[PDB]
Design a protein around this ligand. Structure first.
Ligand code: PUZ
Length: 208
């Protein structure tokens, strides 16, 4: 079964700002997702230092960037710590509430969209370029889930029956029709080089 959840008002509001504000420098979404993956990889690495078995679900600590013109998706895959059901439904919302408030405050003082990551809500920059985001995630202590939202005030969570991923998180960006440049190899390489060149994990850009 699919469960449907309301975003808290603040998140819905930040999602609408991101979708509605005129802002041409959309490419920043990518480094925010990469940065999130790098935090999650840092987290499982740290946890394995005292418990090597946290890596039984996979030892490779990496990020793949997967474009698919047929589906119109750009997928960011990591083998980081992953999110539990409790994360998806409760903790993210808690974290994202305070972070939205500070971000929205900062925008008044003429901060801009590109600083979203400093407030722990960079994930929502996905909506600069994606009409829909699907997040598939697997934590050691929990089942594989799929989160999804097209914004509009709600998100769904379900257990995922797709290919098991081991451990980690995939963020599938269903791109808007006018954002297919982010399916292009040279475009992705250009962005990664400019904003993400010093990440402490291998980034593989898949080709089609
Ligand atoms: C809990 C918490 C904060 C981190 C949540 N998170 C994020 C950020 C995030 C992910 C998300 O997915 C639906 C929704 C909101 C959101 O930010 C507030 N990306 C990842 C990721 N790649 N791997 C793991 F393990 N966790 C992630």
């Amino acid at each position: 079964h699919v469960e449907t959840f309301a975003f808290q008002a603040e998140i819905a509001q930040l999602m609408s700002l991101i979708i509605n504000t005129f802002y041409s420098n959309k490419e920043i979404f990518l480094r925010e997702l990469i940065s999130n993956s790098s935090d999650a990889l840092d987290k499982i690495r740290y946890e394995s230092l005292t418990d090597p078995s946290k890596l039984d679900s996979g030892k490779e600590l990496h990020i793949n960037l997967i474009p698919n013109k047929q589906d119109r998706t750009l997928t960011i895959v990591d083998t980081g710590i992953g999110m539990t059901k409790a994360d998806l439904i409760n903790n993210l919302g808690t974290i994202a509430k305070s972070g939205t408030k500070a971000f929205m405050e900062a925008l008044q003082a003429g901060a801009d969209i590109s600083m979203i990551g400093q407030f722990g809500v960079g994930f929502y920059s996905a909506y600069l370029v994606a009409e829909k985001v699907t997040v598939i995630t697997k934590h050691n202590d929990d089942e594989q889930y799929a989160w999804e939202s097209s914004a509009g005030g709600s998100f769904t969570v379900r257990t995922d029956t797709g290919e098991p991923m081991g451990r980690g998180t995939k963020v599938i960006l269903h791109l808007k029709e006018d954002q297919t440049e982010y399916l292009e190899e040279r475009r992705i390489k250009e962005i990664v080089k400019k904003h993400s060149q010093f990440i402490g994990y291998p980034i593989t850009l898949f080709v089609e």
